[PDB]
Write a protein that binds this ligand. Structure first.
Ligand SMILES: COc1ccc(C)cc1NC(=O)N1CCN(C(=O)c2ccco2)CC1
Length: 121
């Protein structure tokens, strides 16, 4: 299964499934500084799923590893900002992260396999 480009549509479909999850709603759009005015004191690099989708559609990811790094930043930002590991929004982040990791595993493996096949000779 050695298509070097297949990861892009596979990531588009996974982002579609994440946008259907009720657990994504806090992470769809960049955090609101008016409601969370200390947010940028704690978080150096904001990230959200609309930015990830736009970066993918613009043709500004070279690999699914780069996309996976930006999605993992959404989750590390939620863990760094939570005032409590028992909070609603952080709790939603941990369920969404498990879902994402379960689905992205084979996208990464297939891409890396396809690049090794390309370099086989
Ligand atoms: C309902 O969400 C929205 C609706 C509409 C907009 C425009 C933004 C948000 N996100 C938003 O306000 N967030 C709060 C701060 N975050 C955290 O990860 C976190 C951990 C513990 C408390 O917050 C990111 C998500």
């Amino acid at each position: 299964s050695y298509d070097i480009q297949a990861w892009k549509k596979q990531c588009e479909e996974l982002l579609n499934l994440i946008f259907q999850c009720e657990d994504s709603e806090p992470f769809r759009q960049p955090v609101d500084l008016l409601e969370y005015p200390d947010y940028r004191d704690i978080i150096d690099t904001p990230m959200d799923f609309a930015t990830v989708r736009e970066t993918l559609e613009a043709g500004n990811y070279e690999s699914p590893m780069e996309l996976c790094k930006d999605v993992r930043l959404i989750f590390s930002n939620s863990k760094a900002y939570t005032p409590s590991k028992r909070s609603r929004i952080y709790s939603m982040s941990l369920r969404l992260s498990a879902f994402f990791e379960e689905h992205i595993s084979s996208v990464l493996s297939d891409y890396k396999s396809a690049l090794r096949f390309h370099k086989r000779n």
